[PDB]
Short mmCIF file of C-alpha atoms and ligand atoms in Angstrom, two decimals:
data_model
loop_
_atom_site.label_atom_id
_atom_site.label_comp_id
_atom_site.label_asym_id
_atom_site.label_seq_id
_atom_site.Cartn_x
_atom_site.Cartn_y
_atom_site.Cartn_z
CA UNK X 2 113.20 114.71 100.99
CA UNK X 3 115.59 112.22 102.66
CA UNK X 4 114.40 108.72 103.64
CA UNK X 5 116.51 107.19 106.34
CA UNK X 6 117.65 103.62 105.77
CA UNK X 7 116.49 100.85 108.07
CA UNK X 8 117.88 98.38 110.63
CA UNK X 9 116.29 94.90 110.28
CA UNK X 10 115.16 93.83 113.79
CA UNK X 11 115.53 90.37 115.32
CA UNK X 12 111.83 89.67 114.53
CA UNK X 13 112.24 90.64 110.84
CA UNK X 14 110.57 94.01 111.06
CA UNK X 15 112.42 96.92 109.54
CA UNK X 16 112.76 100.16 111.41
CA UNK X 17 113.87 103.52 110.03
CA UNK X 18 117.08 104.53 111.75
CA UNK X 19 116.12 108.15 112.52
CA UNK X 20 113.05 108.87 114.67
CA UNK X 21 111.38 112.16 115.40
CA UNK X 22 111.28 112.77 119.13
CA UNK X 23 108.03 114.05 120.60
CA UNK X 24 108.96 114.30 124.25
CA UNK X 25 108.43 117.76 125.69
CA UNK X 26 111.37 118.06 128.09
CA UNK X 27 112.92 120.83 125.98
CA UNK X 28 109.69 122.67 125.20
CA UNK X 29 109.93 126.37 126.04
CA UNK X 30 107.18 128.42 127.71
CA UNK X 31 106.33 129.79 124.27
CA UNK X 32 105.83 126.27 122.86
CA UNK X 33 102.22 124.99 122.80
CA UNK X 34 101.51 121.31 122.37
CA UNK X 35 100.03 121.78 118.87
CA UNK X 36 103.60 122.27 117.68
CA UNK X 37 104.00 118.49 118.06
CA UNK X 38 101.25 117.88 115.49
CA UNK X 39 102.98 120.31 113.14
CA UNK X 40 106.41 118.77 113.81
CA UNK X 41 105.13 115.27 113.01
CA UNK X 42 103.66 116.54 109.77
CA UNK X 43 106.80 118.42 108.79
CA UNK X 44 108.97 115.40 109.65
CA UNK X 45 106.96 113.09 107.43
CA UNK X 46 107.00 115.72 104.68
CA UNK X 47 110.82 115.87 105.02
CA UNK X 48 111.11 112.10 104.68
CA UNK X 49 110.86 110.79 108.23
CA UNK X 50 108.99 107.52 108.55
CA UNK X 51 109.58 106.88 112.28
CA UNK X 52 107.96 108.82 115.15
CA UNK X 53 108.83 108.21 118.85
CA UNK X 54 106.18 109.10 121.44
CA UNK X 55 104.89 107.88 124.81
CA UNK X 56 101.73 107.78 126.88
CA UNK X 57 103.44 109.88 129.56
CA UNK X 58 104.18 112.71 127.10
CA UNK X 59 100.44 113.40 126.93
CA UNK X 60 100.83 114.25 123.24
CA UNK X 61 99.77 111.05 121.49
CA UNK X 62 96.70 112.94 120.35
CA UNK X 63 98.88 115.53 118.58
CA UNK X 64 101.05 112.80 117.07
CA UNK X 65 97.89 111.14 115.82
CA UNK X 66 96.64 114.42 114.37
CA UNK X 67 99.92 114.90 112.47
CA UNK X 68 99.91 111.33 111.17
CA UNK X 69 96.29 111.63 110.09
CA UNK X 70 97.02 114.86 108.21
CA UNK X 71 100.06 113.34 106.49
CA UNK X 72 98.00 110.33 105.39
CA UNK X 73 95.01 112.44 104.29
CA UNK X 74 97.23 114.77 102.27
CA UNK X 75 98.91 111.83 100.55
CA UNK X 76 102.42 112.15 101.99
CA UNK X 77 102.44 108.53 103.17
CA UNK X 78 100.26 105.53 103.82
CA UNK X 79 99.93 103.95 107.25
CA UNK X 80 102.05 100.95 106.31
CA UNK X 81 104.91 103.26 105.30
CA UNK X 82 105.06 104.74 108.82
CA UNK X 83 106.76 103.25 111.87
CA UNK X 84 105.19 104.53 115.09
CA UNK X 85 106.78 103.85 118.48
CA UNK X 86 105.04 104.45 121.81
CA UNK X 87 105.63 103.42 125.42
CA UNK X 88 103.86 101.80 128.37
CA UNK X 89 104.01 104.00 131.45
CA UNK X 90 105.22 102.91 134.90
CA UNK X 91 101.74 102.63 136.47
CA UNK X 92 100.62 100.01 133.95
CA UNK X 93 103.07 97.20 134.71
CA UNK X 94 100.73 94.43 135.86
CA UNK X 95 100.35 91.82 133.13
CA UNK X 96 96.64 92.54 132.59
CA UNK X 97 97.20 96.30 132.27
CA UNK X 98 99.52 96.14 129.26
CA UNK X 99 97.04 95.41 126.47
CA UNK X 100 94.47 97.96 127.72
CA UNK X 101 97.18 100.61 128.09
CA UNK X 102 98.23 99.96 124.49
CA UNK X 103 94.62 100.13 123.31
CA UNK X 104 94.33 103.51 125.05
CA UNK X 105 97.47 104.76 123.28
CA UNK X 106 96.16 103.48 119.97
CA UNK X 107 92.85 105.28 120.47
CA UNK X 108 94.67 108.57 121.15
CA UNK X 109 96.94 108.01 118.13
CA UNK X 110 94.04 107.11 115.86
CA UNK X 111 95.83 103.85 114.91
CA UNK X 112 94.84 100.15 114.78
CA UNK X 113 98.33 98.88 115.67
CA UNK X 114 101.68 100.21 116.85
CA UNK X 115 104.93 99.28 115.11
CA UNK X 116 106.95 99.24 118.35
CA UNK X 117 105.71 99.18 121.93
CA UNK X 118 108.28 99.75 124.69
CA UNK X 119 108.26 99.30 128.41
CA UNK X 120 109.21 102.92 129.29
CA UNK X 121 111.16 102.02 132.47
CA UNK X 122 111.79 98.80 134.41
CA UNK X 123 110.32 100.50 137.51
CA UNK X 124 106.67 99.98 138.46
CA UNK X 125 104.74 102.69 140.32
CA UNK X 126 101.26 103.33 141.55
CA UNK X 127 99.44 106.10 139.74
CA UNK X 128 100.68 108.61 142.34
CA UNK X 129 104.33 107.76 141.57
CA UNK X 130 104.61 105.78 144.78
CA UNK X 131 106.81 102.71 144.35
CA UNK X 132 105.47 99.31 143.42
CA UNK X 133 107.41 96.01 143.05
CA UNK X 134 105.93 94.27 140.00
CA UNK X 135 108.63 92.27 138.20
CA UNK X 136 109.25 93.63 134.70
CA UNK X 137 109.19 89.97 133.60
CA UNK X 138 105.48 90.04 134.30
CA UNK X 139 105.07 93.25 132.33
CA UNK X 140 106.98 91.60 129.49
CA UNK X 141 104.45 88.80 129.39
CA UNK X 142 101.78 91.45 128.79
CA UNK X 143 104.03 92.82 126.01
CA UNK X 144 104.26 89.31 124.49
CA UNK X 145 100.46 89.16 124.61
CA UNK X 146 100.10 92.52 122.81
CA UNK X 147 102.39 91.23 120.06
CA UNK X 148 100.51 87.92 119.71
CA UNK X 149 97.24 89.83 119.44
CA UNK X 150 98.63 91.88 116.55
CA UNK X 151 98.35 95.19 118.40
CA UNK X 152 102.12 95.68 118.46
CA UNK X 153 104.24 94.46 115.55
CA UNK X 154 107.41 94.52 117.67
CA UNK X 155 108.11 94.83 121.38
CA UNK X 156 111.07 96.23 123.30
CA UNK X 157 112.18 98.08 126.38
CA UNK X 158 113.65 101.40 127.47
CA UNK X 159 115.95 102.39 130.32
CA UNK X 160 117.00 98.79 131.01
CA UNK X 161 120.54 98.23 132.27
CA UNK X 162 122.80 95.35 131.36
CA UNK X 163 121.76 93.08 134.23
CA UNK X 164 118.10 93.69 133.44
CA UNK X 165 118.63 93.00 129.75
CA UNK X 166 120.41 89.71 130.55
CA UNK X 167 117.65 88.65 132.98
CA UNK X 168 114.94 89.58 130.53
CA UNK X 169 116.65 87.63 127.72
CA UNK X 170 117.21 84.55 129.90
CA UNK X 171 113.65 84.46 131.21
CA UNK X 172 111.42 85.24 128.25
CA UNK X 173 110.64 83.52 124.95
CA UNK X 174 111.11 86.60 122.87
CA UNK X 175 113.84 89.14 123.58
CA UNK X 176 113.27 92.82 123.00
CA UNK X 177 113.96 94.13 119.49
CA UNK X 178 115.23 97.38 121.03
CA UNK X 179 116.52 98.96 124.21
CA UNK X 180 115.92 102.71 124.09
CA UNK X 181 118.50 104.45 126.27
CA UNK X 182 120.28 107.80 126.60
CA UNK X 183 123.26 108.14 124.27
CA UNK X 184 125.13 111.37 123.59
CA UNK X 185 128.71 112.63 123.97
CA UNK X 186 128.60 113.08 127.73
CA UNK X 187 126.72 109.81 128.38
CA UNK X 188 128.03 107.38 125.82
CA UNK X 189 126.93 104.07 127.43
CA UNK X 190 129.59 102.11 125.58
CA UNK X 191 129.42 98.86 127.56
CA UNK X 192 125.61 98.74 127.59
CA UNK X 193 125.39 99.43 123.87
CA UNK X 194 127.94 96.69 123.19
CA UNK X 195 126.04 94.28 125.46
CA UNK X 196 122.74 94.90 123.72
CA UNK X 197 124.24 94.66 120.25
CA UNK X 198 126.00 91.41 121.13
CA UNK X 199 122.55 89.96 121.98
CA UNK X 200 120.94 91.19 118.73
CA UNK X 201 119.08 93.97 120.51
CA UNK X 202 119.25 97.26 118.63
CA UNK X 203 119.60 100.55 120.51
CA UNK X 204 117.54 103.71 120.12
CA UNK X 205 119.48 106.74 121.43
CA UNK X 206 117.39 109.29 123.26
CA UNK X 207 118.43 112.86 124.14
CA UNK X 208 120.96 112.56 121.32
CA UNK X 209 122.07 116.22 121.55
CA UNK X 210 123.19 115.80 125.17
CA UNK X 211 124.15 119.07 126.84
CA UNK X 212 125.25 120.63 123.55
CA UNK X 213 121.74 122.10 123.45
CA UNK X 214 120.20 123.97 126.38
CA UNK X 215 118.75 121.86 129.20
CA UNK X 216 117.62 124.79 131.37
CA UNK X 217 120.62 124.30 133.63
CA UNK X 218 123.91 125.99 134.33
CA UNK X 219 127.10 124.05 134.86
CA UNK X 220 126.64 121.73 131.90
CA UNK X 221 129.67 119.63 130.92
CA UNK X 222 131.51 120.26 127.64
CA UNK X 223 131.20 120.18 124.69
CA UNK X 224 129.43 123.44 123.89
CA UNK X 225 128.07 124.06 120.40
CA UNK X 226 131.25 126.03 119.56
CA UNK X 227 133.55 123.28 120.82
CA UNK X 228 136.58 123.10 118.48
CA UNK X 229 136.36 119.33 118.01
CA UNK X 230 132.70 119.54 116.97
CA UNK X 231 133.08 122.62 114.79
CA UNK X 232 136.09 121.15 112.98
CA UNK X 233 133.99 118.09 112.17
CA UNK X 234 131.10 120.23 110.99
CA UNK X 235 133.50 122.14 108.75
CA UNK X 236 135.19 119.01 107.46
CA UNK X 237 131.94 117.44 106.24
CA UNK X 238 129.98 120.63 105.43
CA UNK X 239 127.38 119.67 108.01
CA UNK X 240 126.02 121.29 111.13
CA UNK X 241 127.19 120.37 114.64
CA UNK X 242 123.77 118.82 115.20
CA UNK X 243 124.28 116.60 112.16
CA UNK X 244 127.71 115.57 113.43
CA UNK X 245 126.21 114.55 116.77
CA UNK X 246 123.48 112.51 115.12
CA UNK X 247 125.86 110.89 112.60
CA UNK X 248 128.13 109.89 115.52
CA UNK X 249 125.24 107.86 116.89
CA UNK X 250 124.47 106.35 113.46
CA UNK X 251 128.14 105.28 113.14
CA UNK X 252 127.83 103.51 116.48
CA UNK X 253 124.93 101.53 114.95
CA UNK X 254 122.25 103.40 116.92
CA UNK X 255 118.85 104.85 116.03
CA UNK X 256 118.92 108.48 117.19
CA UNK X 257 115.72 110.22 118.25
CA UNK X 258 116.27 113.93 117.54
CA UNK X 259 113.44 116.12 118.87
CA UNK X 260 112.65 119.30 116.99
CA UNK X 261 109.64 121.44 116.42
CA UNK X 262 111.48 123.66 113.87
CA UNK X 263 110.85 122.95 110.19
CA UNK X 264 114.42 123.55 109.10
CA UNK X 265 116.11 121.62 111.95
CA UNK X 266 113.70 118.72 111.43
CA UNK X 267 114.90 118.49 107.86
CA UNK X 268 118.58 118.81 108.84
CA UNK X 269 118.29 116.09 111.45
CA UNK X 270 117.59 113.31 108.90
CA UNK X 271 120.21 114.49 106.35
CA UNK X 272 122.88 112.11 107.68
CA UNK X 273 123.49 109.67 104.84
CA UNK X 274 125.85 111.49 102.52
CA UNK X 275 128.82 111.35 104.94
CA UNK X 276 130.20 109.34 107.80
CA UNK X 277 132.65 109.81 110.65
CA UNK X 278 135.96 108.01 110.81
CA UNK X 279 136.84 105.62 113.61
CA UNK X 280 139.21 108.22 115.08
CA UNK X 281 136.41 110.84 115.05
CA UNK X 282 133.97 108.50 116.78
CA UNK X 283 136.69 107.79 119.35
CA UNK X 284 137.26 111.52 119.85
CA UNK X 285 133.60 112.12 120.55
CA UNK X 286 133.54 109.10 122.91
CA UNK X 287 136.20 110.91 124.90
CA UNK X 288 133.66 113.53 126.02
CA UNK X 289 131.94 110.85 128.14
CA UNK X 290 131.20 111.80 131.75
CA UNK X 291 128.39 109.28 132.41
CA UNK X 292 126.36 112.40 133.08
CA UNK X 293 122.71 111.90 132.23
CA UNK X 294 120.46 114.52 130.72
CA UNK X 295 117.53 112.49 132.09
CA UNK X 296 117.85 112.35 135.86
CA UNK X 297 115.43 109.99 137.61
CA UNK X 298 117.34 109.88 140.90
CA UNK X 299 114.24 110.52 143.02
CA UNK X 300 113.45 106.86 142.17
CA UNK X 301 116.85 105.53 143.28
CA UNK X 302 115.43 103.37 146.08
CA UNK X 303 112.62 101.91 143.95
CA UNK X 304 112.65 98.25 142.97
CA UNK X 305 114.36 97.81 139.58
CA UNK X 306 115.87 101.34 139.45
CA UNK X 307 118.17 101.03 136.42
CA UNK X 308 120.67 103.88 136.86
N1 NAP N 1 113.02 107.52 128.71
C1 NAP N 1 112.96 107.61 127.36
O1 NAP N 1 112.77 106.60 126.65
C2 NAP N 1 113.29 108.94 126.79
C3 NAP N 1 113.92 109.95 127.55
C4 NAP N 1 114.25 111.15 126.91
C5 NAP N 1 113.89 111.29 125.58
N2 NAP N 1 113.24 110.32 124.88
C6 NAP N 1 112.88 110.54 123.48
O2 NAP N 1 114.01 111.07 122.79
C7 NAP N 1 113.65 112.31 122.21
C8 NAP N 1 114.83 113.29 122.21
O3 NAP N 1 115.30 113.67 123.46
P1 NAP N 1 115.05 115.14 124.02
O4 NAP N 1 113.61 115.49 123.93
O5 NAP N 1 115.73 115.21 125.34
O6 NAP N 1 115.77 116.15 123.03
P2 NAP N 1 117.06 116.19 122.04
O7 NAP N 1 116.57 115.68 120.75
O8 NAP N 1 118.18 115.62 122.75
O9 NAP N 1 117.24 117.74 122.06
C9 NAP N 1 116.24 118.59 121.58
C10 NAP N 1 116.63 120.06 121.58
O10 NAP N 1 117.61 120.30 120.56
C11 NAP N 1 117.13 121.31 119.70
N3 NAP N 1 117.56 120.95 118.37
C12 NAP N 1 117.02 119.98 117.60
N4 NAP N 1 117.70 119.81 116.49
C13 NAP N 1 118.74 120.70 116.51
C14 NAP N 1 119.78 120.98 115.62
N5 NAP N 1 119.96 120.35 114.38
N6 NAP N 1 120.64 121.95 115.99
C15 NAP N 1 120.51 122.59 117.15
N7 NAP N 1 119.53 122.34 118.03
C16 NAP N 1 118.65 121.38 117.71
C17 NAP N 1 115.65 121.35 119.95
O11 NAP N 1 115.11 122.61 119.59
P3 NAP N 1 114.01 122.78 118.44
O12 NAP N 1 112.83 121.91 118.82
O13 NAP N 1 113.68 124.28 118.48
O14 NAP N 1 114.63 122.42 117.16
C18 NAP N 1 115.53 121.04 121.37
O15 NAP N 1 115.80 122.15 122.19
C19 NAP N 1 112.47 112.74 123.02
O16 NAP N 1 111.76 113.80 122.43
C20 NAP N 1 111.75 111.50 123.17
O17 NAP N 1 111.11 111.15 121.97
C21 NAP N 1 112.94 109.15 125.48
#
């Protein structure tokens, strides 16, 4: 239906600039994990060519099922898809990185991943107890996975500006991407600017912020009926969700909208027949509260906590 354009990464690889999210943080009680397989299929059918997943989501198998069905039914070939997955926090020793990737690949039914990310800069033991492995060591394992051909590109997630600078100064290849939370109430303007200045593209997770339900009360504005958002939706004949995603696109970001609904999946990639003005982007930036949807504060005292 709609194929998203690409950003060309610092290693030459091209990445589609909308990714389907497959994290399960928003999944309701009535939502079984097979809906991820169906969502992946529907997304590809609707023109998506980029899927974001992670070992820790425990749904790589479903993602792989959806990919396999899309390929078998002739929607796409493997080389037309861009699959992103992530190394979990208990696999940070250098020698664990390649085997962890091979495990992800087996679950996904793939021979290579397009993008492998360090999920967080924190290292833990398998029981979530803190460890102190330097993410520079983990990055050497990432460099190895790339040299072996198992990952076409390598990047990071949840790295702050100091960590990005240290990683860049102390490695031979810098990340292609930093995947971080970006939405109207957590706009991360300085970190985005820092990454972009270094040629590191940004993937924006939890792109809908608190405009969608997070199973909490006391969420910060804007609501879905916020007058600024609904005026924008009306102006461009788009939904509020599309406005929120286009905002991220106009900041040069790769949003990762999660949906398991056929219609919303299709809406969430239909972002390329309009654009926001600089004043509109500035207005949305004014909602910033540095209030994260993804709260990892139980890890605040861990080595390399990024927030
Ligand atoms: N540490 C990390 O690197 C990290 C952290 C968080 C997330 N992520 C990634 O980023 C993805 C997105 O973040 P997220 O899972 O927090 O969710 P999100 O994409 O911010 O929000 C998803 C929610 O919005 C709803 N929705 C989707 N499209 C909509 C639309 N057009 N209009 C109204 N509602 C809409 C969804 O419902 P329906 O499903 O019913 O449509 C769901 O409840 C994750 O799935 C994951 O891939 C990565």
